[PDB]
Enzyme design. Structure first.
Site, PDB file in Angstrom:
ATOM      1  N   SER A 113       4.168  -3.120  11.274  1.00 32.75           N
ATOM      2  CA  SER A 113       3.936  -3.937  10.094  1.00 32.75           C
ATOM      3  C   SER A 113       2.440  -4.197   9.971  1.00 32.75           C
ATOM      4  O   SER A 113       1.855  -4.631  10.944  1.00 32.75           O
ATOM      5  CB  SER A 113       4.712  -5.219  10.161  1.00 32.75           C
ATOM      6  OG  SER A 113       4.361  -6.118   9.116  1.00 32.75           O
ATOM      7  N   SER A 114       1.830  -3.915   8.814  1.00 31.63           N
ATOM      8  CA  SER A 114       0.460  -4.364   8.608  1.00 31.63           C
ATOM      9  C   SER A 114       0.457  -5.881   8.360  1.00 31.63           C
ATOM     10  O   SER A 114       1.494  -6.505   8.059  1.00 31.63           O
ATOM     11  CB  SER A 114      -0.237  -3.643   7.442  1.00 31.63           C
ATOM     12  OG  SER A 114       0.015  -4.273   6.189  1.00 31.63           O
TER      13      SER A 114
ATOM     14  N   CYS B 271       0.804  -1.211   0.000  1.00 32.25           N
ATOM     15  CA  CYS B 271       0.000   0.000   0.000  1.00 32.25           C
ATOM     16  C   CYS B 271       0.846   1.273   0.000  1.00 32.25           C
ATOM     17  O   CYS B 271       2.044   1.273   0.227  1.00 32.25           O
ATOM     18  CB  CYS B 271      -1.100  -0.023   1.075  1.00 32.25           C
ATOM     19  SG  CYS B 271      -0.735   0.777   2.655  1.00 32.25           S
TER      20      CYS B 271
ATOM     21  N   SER C 285      -7.062   0.373   4.873  1.00 33.12           N
ATOM     22  CA  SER C 285      -6.480   0.686   3.547  1.00 33.12           C
ATOM     23  C   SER C 285      -5.165   1.491   3.587  1.00 33.12           C
ATOM     24  O   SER C 285      -4.450   1.452   2.589  1.00 33.12           O
ATOM     25  CB  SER C 285      -7.479   1.342   2.634  1.00 33.12           C
ATOM     26  OG  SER C 285      -8.019   2.542   3.203  1.00 33.12           O
TER      27      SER C 285
HETATM   28  N1  LIG Z   1      -6.140  -3.875   2.956  1.00 34.23           N
HETATM   29  C1  LIG Z   1      -5.877  -3.267   1.750  1.00 34.23           C
HETATM   30  N2  LIG Z   1      -5.479  -1.977   1.657  1.00 34.23           N
HETATM   31  C2  LIG Z   1      -5.322  -1.423   0.434  1.00 34.23           C
HETATM   32  C3  LIG Z   1      -5.694  -2.090  -0.738  1.00 34.23           C
HETATM   33  C4  LIG Z   1      -6.181  -3.409  -0.645  1.00 34.23           C
HETATM   34  O1  LIG Z   1      -6.451  -4.142  -1.597  1.00 34.23           O
HETATM   35  N3  LIG Z   1      -6.179  -3.971   0.625  1.00 34.23           N
HETATM   36  N4  LIG Z   1      -5.729  -1.400  -1.956  1.00 34.23           N
HETATM   37  C5  LIG Z   1      -5.126  -0.087  -2.034  1.00 34.23           C
HETATM   38  C6  LIG Z   1      -5.660   0.721  -3.182  1.00 34.23           C
HETATM   39  S1  LIG Z   1      -4.977   0.299  -4.722  1.00 34.23           S
HETATM   40  C7  LIG Z   1      -6.492   1.722  -2.954  1.00 34.23           C
HETATM   41  S2  LIG Z   1      -7.150   2.555  -4.292  1.00 34.23           S
HETATM   42  C8  LIG Z   1      -6.908   2.130  -1.578  1.00 34.23           C
HETATM   43  C9  LIG Z   1      -8.395   2.380  -1.462  1.00 34.23           C
HETATM   44  O2  LIG Z   1      -8.559   2.732  -0.117  1.00 34.23           O
HETATM   45  P1  LIG Z   1      -9.980   3.362   0.340  1.00 34.23           P
HETATM   46  O3  LIG Z   1     -10.542   4.195  -0.737  1.00 34.23           O
HETATM   47  O4  LIG Z   1      -9.948   3.849   1.742  1.00 34.23           O
HETATM   48  O5  LIG Z   1     -10.873   2.009   0.362  1.00 34.23           O
HETATM   49  P2  LIG Z   1     -12.236   1.533  -0.352  1.00 34.23           P
HETATM   50  O6  LIG Z   1     -12.716   0.373   0.528  1.00 34.23           O
HETATM   51  O7  LIG Z   1     -12.096   1.206  -1.784  1.00 34.23           O
HETATM   52  O8  LIG Z   1     -13.375   2.662  -0.259  1.00 34.23           O
HETATM   53  C10 LIG Z   1     -13.312   3.658   0.781  1.00 34.23           C
HETATM   54  C11 LIG Z   1     -14.664   3.898   1.372  1.00 34.23           C
HETATM   55  O9  LIG Z   1     -15.521   4.521   0.395  1.00 34.23           O
HETATM   56  C12 LIG Z   1     -16.821   4.424   0.987  1.00 34.23           C
HETATM   57  N5  LIG Z   1     -17.811   4.922   0.017  1.00 34.23           N
HETATM   58  C13 LIG Z   1     -18.479   4.230  -0.949  1.00 34.23           C
HETATM   59  N6  LIG Z   1     -19.268   4.948  -1.715  1.00 34.23           N
HETATM   60  C14 LIG Z   1     -19.030   6.248  -1.297  1.00 34.23           C
HETATM   61  C15 LIG Z   1     -19.589   7.485  -1.726  1.00 34.23           C
HETATM   62  O10 LIG Z   1     -20.464   7.724  -2.581  1.00 34.23           O
HETATM   63  N7  LIG Z   1     -19.088   8.549  -0.962  1.00 34.23           N
HETATM   64  C16 LIG Z   1     -18.200   8.440   0.084  1.00 34.23           C
HETATM   65  N8  LIG Z   1     -17.920   9.571   0.737  1.00 34.23           N
HETATM   66  N9  LIG Z   1     -17.719   7.282   0.551  1.00 34.23           N
HETATM   67  C17 LIG Z   1     -18.157   6.229  -0.189  1.00 34.23           C
HETATM   68  C18 LIG Z   1     -16.927   2.949   1.389  1.00 34.23           C
HETATM   69  O11 LIG Z   1     -18.001   2.753   2.267  1.00 34.23           O
HETATM   70  C19 LIG Z   1     -15.487   2.655   1.865  1.00 34.23           C
HETATM   71  O12 LIG Z   1     -15.448   2.548   3.282  1.00 34.23           O
HETATM   72  O13 LIG Z   1      -6.586   1.109  -0.589  1.00 34.23           O
HETATM   73  C20 LIG Z   1      -5.239   0.685  -0.727  1.00 34.23           C
HETATM   74  N10 LIG Z   1      -4.950  -0.116   0.436  1.00 34.23           N
HETATM   75  S1  F3S Z   2       0.436  -2.737   3.267  1.00 33.55           S
HETATM   76 FE1  F3S Z   2       0.708  -0.502   3.830  1.00 33.55          FE
HETATM   77  S2  F3S Z   2       0.469  -0.105   5.979  1.00 33.55           S
HETATM   78 FE2  F3S Z   2       2.558  -0.594   5.688  1.00 33.55          FE
HETATM   79  S3  F3S Z   2       3.164  -2.767   5.943  1.00 33.55           S
HETATM   80 FE3  F3S Z   2       2.583  -2.504   3.793  1.00 33.55          FE
HETATM   81  S4  F3S Z   2       3.005  -0.218   3.459  1.00 33.55           S
END
Ligand SMILES: Nc1nc2c(c(=O)[nH]1)N[C@H]1C(S)=C(S)[C@@H](COP(=O)(O)OP(=O)(O)OC[C@H]3O[C@@H](n4cnc5c(=O)[nH]c(N)nc54)[C@H](O)[C@@H]3O)O[C@H]1N2
Ligand code: F3S
Ligand SMILES: Nc1nc2c(c(=O)[nH]1)N[C@H]1C(S)=C(S)[C@@H](COP(=O)(O)OP(=O)(O)OC[C@H]3O[C@@H](n4cnc5c(=O)[nH]c(N)nc54)[C@H](O)[C@@H]3O)O[C@H]1N2
Ligand SMILES: Nc1nc2c(c(=O)[nH]1)N[C@H]1C(S)=C(S)[C@@H](COP(=O)(O)OP(=O)(O)OC[C@H]3O[C@@H](n4cnc5c(=O)[nH]c(N)nc54)[C@H](O)[C@@H]3O)O[C@H]1N2
Ligand SMILES: [Mo]
Ligand code: NA
Ligand SMILES: [O]
EC number: 1.20.9.1
Lengths: 824, 118, 235
Positions: free
Chosen positions: A97-98, A23, A237
């Site tokens: 560490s995550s 991430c 995330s």
């Molecule tokens: N554990 C983990 N972490 C990751 C990733 C992963 O696969 N796993 N992927 C990474 C990537 S590539 C990305 S892009 C990021 C994404 O990280 P985030 O964007 O934080 O995660 P998402 O779960 O896609 O969506 C965020 C929030 O949007 C809310 N939401 C949905 N519809 C709407 C709306 O109309 N308006 C608003 N205000 N909120 C809304 C949802 O309820 C959700 O809680 O995470 C990154 N980190």
């Molecule tokens: S998934 Fe993200 S929170 Fe840290 S351990 Fe890896 S950079």
């Protein structure tokens, strides 16, 4: 193997630096590597960790589990222990560490481990079966088809979907190699990005307003009075940004530092506001940490962010909770935005569903002057809830207007920033076309001779994914059928057979990947790539902190760094054009004389803005040349925040903490530009699904699962916990459909059909759901629409559908927890 | 394989055993009802050891032949319901007529179309 | 709504004459989209010659002008305008039907008689029809008749796994051994009792595909006195 001990690294074990593969946060790690038959002693000075394993360790002393260890087998046949553990002295993570980064050791390639199925050689679907093929043959077929397409159709016949990101499967070497190949050499405009179906940006509006989306430091989260998390679930995330920076603020551990920097400013207890339709683990954890009174959950109606920000903007303007000297000196368009964006609290409340008192409170906490006279330092963090929200461009217009008027850019403890997804690592030539092209629609409509997926898998992650797959599988089948008739053909004849099949609806598909993936259902050709640790790789995190991940082991088989795959293709194409006596076309394929990834760093990042350089768009800017691998090594996992401002041997790299602190923005005039933000409701395509079907099909991340689960699908713990994509459902809705945890449902609408296991969640609102996106067992994207904003940004969070019970999976009931993921 | 797998038109997913049997038995039933047994095809082991044996060959044979009553069945290694040893059997000599001890008592062993060390 | 009809002509106007017209709902009509050119009055003027559909034009001087033969330009009713050939597998008789054939002796062919209309809804009240065909008849080969000790005017039960019905025996030299032909649909001895449930892919029944046995009930002296069992094959 044995689950009740680990092999300690010897005191003298080799140690290299590695940024987490995954991430945006880009936590720092160390990789210890030592011969398999050595080990360290338990006494602290007899192991490389410097920890005392002669008695129980206290809490926080270490992060170490078997999942953080492995035994690799190198190309010389020798076996080495590795241990990949977080760096206590890295500023980003401070030894955190995550659960995702923690598994890196397990997800390094070994012949018998979770990486066992890594691509080790070119794979060819020779009409009716998967076989190995040589690199030379693969290049002859792939470059041969590209050449034939260029010769007869021009570049418009050669399509790509390619990563543009940082970290593993991206980064500055890799984005340059691929971008140079696609844009400067082949010169195709038929290119989309891993997460979006055109060559565009997630942040057109904020950029056009003069505010690049990564404008602060992680330290700003420590200095803020108020943090907004908009469309964002950061505990899951952006875990260690949330854990190591946000939470210490909420807990009061940063109060001293604020007061030291600002002697004459009140700093109340920090507070946090979430704009998210769904009550997430992030909301629950914030309330456990800070108390209910310091957390505001603005549980808006899906798609209503624009109305929210217009109501807030209207209100702070009417209250005078804005920075008039700032607006007057450094902004343009304010008076116009007040008129275009006007919306009363009552109207705001009706559209968003948030009560008026809560709208007022959010404004009071965030923008009303402190007793000492200064405006709160309010950091506005946002991510995919609004980037993939109801009109990406307009939401950002609305938000940035509020931010600019309240001076929440350019002051410490503020910022209006992306939280980020992957890490960042972009250095590319300009896109060669003059229009945005909806690539998936073009493919569905039968355009293109050859399509390469390069470090992505849109089978699992496209919007309107079911339409995509239908079409690609069919088009793929035409090519397989044509190949079938061949016997004893030369490579050149086979190129002709395939090219002809593409005139009859066919499409040749290549995948450049770590793994087969679902793409193997359609691909004709797959090429093996290498990830960080098998190569050197540079990338930056959400505060622009560039680090070098050091190579420490060999890749599987003949797997290669992506930038060197790009050089290989370019050099094949050059040779073919040279051999055909076409000097001018040959020359387009010059500039890929690369032996190692560092060559790509030198040719790209480090040439940007330099004399006699081509046009290069780079997150490193024009001081990128001051960074070298050696200098990054000396920096360690703390790296440098870009852009670099100076370098010398005695002071090392010195960089930039926060952007815009002098009030000069990235526009023609140096001012920040306000924009109109109209409220038009939901898009008609989406509103029609909402009108026809019962459930809002929200979607996104789970903390434990990384992306398309390309590693996790091979991890027995991960598969036991999440054997199938799950869908969070309100328990009352569950009882109405006679489902409970571990039942399987079909989720469907006019766009498609998919499956999920039911996960009853008390916190989900009636008529709403939340499904894990991108997964290997039940692809959520089948039910997303084709709708995109003016720049071809999808409303991935905007879709409605119905839900039908398939049955009870007894095995899931016996093995999967359906207990609450919202901590209290 | 740990659970039923379904290709639901455009993707592999898990499904329940009950659903799988509803779909599989439902199709067999529909075929029996409208086309008779000639619509239901199998290629099935007839052998011993793993993936065969007396329990398994009976279960499958009873299902295919006595219950469904389909003749549309081939064998794992040959594309009809036939024998490797029609001639020897018709000549009155079943193909497994000795003991391993006989190989110890022989003057001469012929190995015909056979690579027995491997 | 849409049934404010006082006469049948109202239904003609609302249906046939609206097909393919502006503001019309979707309507499948053998008249096509030129159906509106037909009115009652114009049909009256055409007389019993009418017009072959589809109508191609109308005016007061030339009346309705229609279409004699379809497909004379080589344009067919497909997406591409071509005629499409189709595979036609031979799979024998349906199992359900083959099982009756395997169990029972006679092919139970069925269909029309020249004099009798359909289910005889009128003819059942007509004293000439009832004198000539008081009961459904079954054409049987005379050699088959002798084996069953039946002749014209005997009553037989016809049965199989699907059902049982009755017919009067009509010896017919031209019927093949093992085959029969029974009048379908009739008011006295319903043939369809012995037809199977089997249908093709679109639920079209194999009404002509059934086998059964035949058992003498007895001699109906009255039929012997009043019904001709002479040959209906003119020579
Ligand atoms: N554990 C983990 N972490 C990751 C990733 C992963 O696969 N796993 N992927 C990474 C990537 S590539 C990305 S892009 C990021 C994404 O990280 P985030 O964007 O934080 O995660 P998402 O779960 O896609 O969506 C965020 C929030 O949007 C809310 N939401 C949905 N519809 C709407 C709306 O109309 N308006 C608003 N205000 N909120 C809304 C949802 O309820 C959700 O809680 O995470 C990154 N980190
Ligand atoms: S998934 Fe993200 S929170 Fe840290 S351990 Fe890896 S950079
Ligand atoms: N419905 C819905 N759809 C979404 C989203 C959502 O919120 N909702 N999120 C979107 C977002 S933000 C994103 S980031 C996309 C993700 O969409 P994708 O990019 O398609 O998904 P990833 O899992 O990140 O794809 C990484 C792929 O590259 C391979 N790989 C990993 N390392 C390397 C490397 O070094 N070299 C190469 N060549 N391959 C490598 C992996 O095996 C995997 O196949 O999905 C998008 N789709
Ligand atoms: N007199 C009279 N005329 C009528 C009617 C009526 O009741 N009485 N009804 C009208 C109606 S609604 C209809 S549908 C038509 C029907 O008109 P037709 O179909 O001509 O008449 P049927 O007697 O039903 O059957 C036609 C022939 O099909 C043959 N046949 C049976 N099985 C097979 C087979 O497997 N293959 C082939 N190739 N032939 C087979 C029979 O021996 C029989 O002579 O008659 C219409 N005209
Ligand atoms: Mo992302
Ligand atoms: Na689907
Ligand atoms: O992303």
């Amino acid at each position: 193997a044995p689950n009740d001990r680990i092999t300690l690294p010897p005191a003298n074990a080799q140690r290299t630096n590695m940024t987490c593969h995954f991430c945006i946060v880009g936590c720092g790690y160390h990789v210890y590597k030592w011969p398999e038959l050595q080990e360290g002693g338990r006494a602290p000075e007899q192991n490389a960790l410097g920890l005392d394993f002669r008695k129980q360790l206290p809490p926080l002393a270490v992060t170490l589990t078997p999942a953080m260890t492995n035994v690799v087998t190198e190309h010389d046949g020798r076996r080495y222990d590795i241990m990949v553990v977080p760096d206590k002295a890295c500023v980003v993570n401070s030894g955190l560490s995550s659960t995702r980064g923690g598994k890196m050791a397990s997800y390094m390639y070994t012949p018998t481990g979770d990486g066992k199925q890594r691509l080790k050689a070119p794979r060819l679907y020779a009409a009716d079966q998967w076989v190995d093929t040589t690199w030379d043959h693969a290049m002859a077929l792939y470059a041969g088809l590209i050449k034939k397409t260029l010769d007869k159709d021009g570049p418009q016949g050669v399509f790509f979907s390619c990563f543009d990101h940082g970290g593993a499967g991206g980064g500055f070497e890799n984005t340059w190699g691929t971008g140079k190949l696609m844009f400067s050499a082949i010169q195709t405009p038929m290119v989309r990005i891993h997460n979006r179906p055109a060559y565009n940006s997630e942040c057109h509006a904020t950029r056009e307003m003069g505010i690049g989306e990564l404008n602060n430091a992680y330290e700003d989260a420590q200095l803020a009075d108020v943090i907004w998390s908009i469309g964002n679930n950061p505990y899951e995330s952006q875990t260690n940004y949330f854990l190591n920076h946000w939470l210490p603020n909420l807990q009061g551990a940063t109060t001293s530092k604020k007061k030291e920097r600002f002697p004459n400013e009140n700093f109340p207890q920090a507070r946090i506001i979430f704009v998210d339709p769904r009550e997430t683990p992030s909301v629950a954890i914030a309330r456990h940490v800070a108390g209910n009174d310091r957390v505001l959950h603005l549980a808006i109606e899906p798609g209503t962010d624009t109305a929210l920000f217009n109501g807030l903007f209207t209100y702070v303007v009417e209250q005078g909770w804005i920075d008039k000297p700032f607006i007057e000196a450094h902004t343009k368009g304010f008076d116009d935005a007040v008129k275009t964006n006007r919306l009363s609290l009552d109207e705001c409340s009706n559209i968003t569903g948030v009560p008026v008192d809560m709208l007022k409170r959010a404004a009071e906490w965030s923008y009303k002057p402190k007793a000492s006279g200064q405006a709160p330092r309010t950091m506005h963090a946002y991510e995919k809830g609004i980037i993939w929200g109801n009109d990406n461009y307009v939401i950002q217009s609305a938000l940035l207007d509020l931010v600019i008027a309240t001076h929440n850019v350019g002051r410490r403890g503020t910022g209006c920033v992306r939280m980020g997804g992957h890490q960042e690592g972009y250095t590319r030539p300009p896109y060669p076309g003059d229009k945005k092209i909806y690539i998936d629609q073009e493919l569905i409509k039968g355009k293109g001779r050859i399509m390469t997926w390069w470090g992505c898998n849109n089978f699992q992650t496209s919007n309107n994914a079911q339409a995509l797959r239908e079409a690609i599988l069919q088009r793929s089948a035409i090519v397989k059928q044509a190949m079938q008739k061949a016997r004893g053909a030369t490579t050149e004849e086979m190129v002709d057979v395939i090219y002809e099949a593409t005139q009859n609806g066919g499409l040749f598909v290549t995948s450049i990947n770590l793994y087969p993936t679902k793409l193997a259902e359609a691909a004709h050709l797959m090429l093996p790539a290498a990830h960080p640790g098998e190569m050197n790789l540079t990338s930056m995190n959400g505060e622009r902190r560039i680090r070098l991940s050091e190579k420490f082991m060999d890749p599987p088989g003949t797997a290669m760094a992506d930038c060197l795959i790009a050089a290989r293709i370019a050099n094949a194409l050059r040779d073919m054009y040279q051999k055909d006596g076409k000097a001018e076309m040959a020359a387009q394929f010059e500039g890929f004389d690369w032996k190692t990834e560092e060559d790509a760093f030198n040719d790209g990042f480090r040439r940007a803005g330099q004399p006699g350089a081509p046009a290069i768009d780079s997150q490193g800017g024009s001081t990128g040349h001051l960074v070298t691998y050696d200098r990054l090594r000396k920096s360690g996992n703390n790296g440098v925040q870009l852009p670099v401002v100076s370098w010398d041997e005695s002071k090392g790299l010195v960089g930039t903490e926060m952007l815009y602190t002098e009030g000069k923005f990235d526009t023609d005039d140096g001012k920040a530009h306000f924009k109109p933000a109209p409220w038009n409701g939901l898009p008609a395509t989406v509103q029609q699904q909402k009108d026809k079907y019962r459930f809002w099909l929200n979607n996104g991340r789970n903390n434990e699962v990384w992306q398309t689960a390309y590693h996790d699908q091979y991890n027995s713990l991960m598969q036991e916990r999440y054997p199938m994509a799950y869908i969070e459902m309100n328990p009352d809705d569950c009882k109405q459909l006679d489902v409970t945890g571990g039942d399987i449902v079909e989720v469907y609408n006019d766009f498609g059909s998919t499956f999920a296991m039911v996960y009853p969640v008390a916190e989900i609102k009636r008529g709403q759901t939340f499904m894990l996106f991108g997964y290997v067992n039940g692809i959520q994207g089948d039910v997303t629409t084709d709708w995109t904003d003016r720049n071809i940004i999808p409303y991935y969070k905007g879709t409605w559908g119905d839900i039908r019970k398939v049955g009870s999976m007894e095995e899931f009931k016996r093995t999967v927890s359906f207990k609450s993921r919202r901590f209290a």
